[PDB]
Symmetry: D2
Subunit: 241 residues, 4 copies
């Protein structure tokens, strides 16, 4: 039996960087995704090329039926689910106005209900000694206009993380969250000018763009031996901004 990690949202960006790093750390990685198979398959093949073991599973993490199937299928691979990382989410902009109610409902459904289901199923499947890690966001501290629905969904996620840490008392399972700022994903760089990039690179005291690998290394600390006494924590990974 190989130790096994399930990562939601693992086809691109931070989730993919997490999948890759956990594979390097020796986990068999289930690359969970919802949309097109192509990026998830790219992730899987990259992991295997570098010497790891991984496979991809499609599931809508906010669909209760698909999530049930996802956890049954993922646990059947190696008979175990040691680590669950919930990284999937969406970040649309919408101000707090009645016309934004559809966007609100979508964000809450995808990010918060989604997180609830992944956490609930993880709490029923993870062994003693396991680890559950959720992705939140640094932007909660800034409360920027149009980030209301997104921040509300992720504040909810953090509340669930802290309560689940207490509900799993006796099982030696840590529950934590990692809250990145923006990172230099391919989508980030394509959708911006060199000038917007330069402006954002100046914001942190470290004065550079953060990378997905830099988020994944903290997630990997939480998933491994150095993270065993970290529990019910939200670690912000944002370069100091």
């Amino acid at each position: 039996s190989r130790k096994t990690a399930l990562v939601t949202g693992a086809s691109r960006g931070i989730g993919r960087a997490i999948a890759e790093r956990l594979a390097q750390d020796g986990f068999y990685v289930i690359v969970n995704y919802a949309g097109n198979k192509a990026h998830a398959q790219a992730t899987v093949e990259h992991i295997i090329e570098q010497g790891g073991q991984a496979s991809a599973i499609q599931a809508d993490v906010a669909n209760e039926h698909e999530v049930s199937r996802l956890f049954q299928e993922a646990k059947a691979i190696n008979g175990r689910l040691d680590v669950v990382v919930h990284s999937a989410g969406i970040m649309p902009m919408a101000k707090i106005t009645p016309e934004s109610l559809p966007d609100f409902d979508k964000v809450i459904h995808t990010n918060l209900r989604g997180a609830f289901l992944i956490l609930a199923h993880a709490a029923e499947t993870v062994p003693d000694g396991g680890r559950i890690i959720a992705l939140s966001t640094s932007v909660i501290a800034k409360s920027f206009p149009a980030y209301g629905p997104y921040i509300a969904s992720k504040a909810g996620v953090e509340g669930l993380v802290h309560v689940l840490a207490n509900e799993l008392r006796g099982r030696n399972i840590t529950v934590n969250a990692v809250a990145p700022g923006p990172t230099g994903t391919d989508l980030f760089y394509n959708g911006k000018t060199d000038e917007q990039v330069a402006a954002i690179a100046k914001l942190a005291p470290l004065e550079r763009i953060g990378t997905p690998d830099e988020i994944a290394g903290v997630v990997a600390m939480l998933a491994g031996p150095d993270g065993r006494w970290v529990n019910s924590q939200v670690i912000r990974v944002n370069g100091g901004f």
Copy 2:
């Protein structure tokens, strides 16, 4: 020769038929607001709140609306503003607190709590942002239990943490309008609902949790809300004030 007596302000209070919301409605009426007592189900308690307000020399009326239904919320704000032609203060106190662990079996509860407490709060805050004048006040009720992360409070805490996030973002979105947005987060409070199921020993055990060693009253929550709604709260903005006796 108060501005409140020269031109009377109007306050809408959701969840005002009982508990903390009733205490808020009564306090704001005694401060001179015309109060719209908003309620969801049977009107007897809401009418009791209105009648108490009027018997103490105040002004108030009641409007039925499910704060979690978008059409009923739009209608509530139309009718509330039409009473006096203005809607100066909005206090959102409606909500539910069921116990449910983070498990697949709790999915219905979670959906209901999020729907009632978080989406409901969105609808009220959004409509308040559309209706309140410059200089107005928006106040939501959160909860002190966020600090404790007790088992079975997951859905409830997630909903109220979400409300607090909306509060801070809205305070920023209303830049330029001179509208404060704040929340008040009580601990356990001596409402009818608090006392009803509990033995004297269980009440005493709760009283011992705070260094003040008693049960806090609904009026003690309402006083803080009243501060936020009036002149002394002019420079308090995007804050969550926990009112819990030190627990």
Copy 3:
């Protein structure tokens, strides 16, 4: 004061000669407290505060004491309590805000602010803990700038974060005495000192930082202190209330 010209309660306000402390002393005197205007250096401003309180119909007197001096603080509390027999409310607003980066050359200024702001706070809180009757109130002033961690604010922030830590522990240490301990954390405020250190352009820039887009006033801080000192603050305990316009 009542018919017998006895003030219903007595409040000691440190740093009450000017600024926020003066606004606090004036507001508490208006609310019916006898006020000890405490001061450290020269008494002209403190005496001016006392005379304004008396002219408005209150009772006040100024007492000299360096809050960081153990013996002068002992004498301060003995004298303050002796005026009416009780010291009901203690507000600690005296403090300094020198700017110094975290470098070895800044050690003197660090030592100064720690001595004045933190040790001072410890003395006032400790003596307040020993002097205030059951039912009393203890209120320290902190700062909103802790949230920002701006360069050169290191020593100041460290002293005020220490104060908040003392506040929370003291609220638990006074369990059983019905004494609330809280802090109020102003943002930038339109005081003499504040304007001395800024150009008009700098003031305008600071004003636009809050969604309310102005500078806060001392009276707007004092109103929240007065809430904590009076009936509407009875269930607020171990809290730091930030009063900054949403900054």
Copy 4:
């Protein structure tokens, strides 16, 4: 002799010693700073060297400005560099917030807060671009227990300095962070306790065991190494969930 070098205050025993040991295992030459008797610091240096590392011990009172100046001179001179600085020295006496506690208060603030101010300040002048500065705080700030007033005040002050220094070092690529442990299973911890008292403490965390100093040191190691490059201005609580 251009080996990456870490200075650890309070490295004689407990968490500081575990930090020194882990950083040596991670490849740093370690300066074991101590204040009082040399014996435990020497034991730490000897253990590091015997495990295949490089280390030496420097005596200095962290709260004395003249001795801290000397300490940073000596520490930088070993290898011409001071890449990582971990401030772990501190004291935790109990004293209620009362006038009679003024001496204890003065002692804690001087040793824990002024001490931290000196180390941080000298670290800001010494650490190279890309360096790391890490202070030890405490999880007990959250609990505000009676008699912990002076201690909590000192450590909250430390945290404020950490956040400000992170902004003051803009442009230098230096992270500043803090690790805030709960109680930990040191020799001194176990000394004053029976089986039953340790069992009562072990029940507190949801993980239901006693935390170890190595478990703190591993988070410090994360912050000092590649995986902590983007963690900046953070206080990480390491307490098993309690």
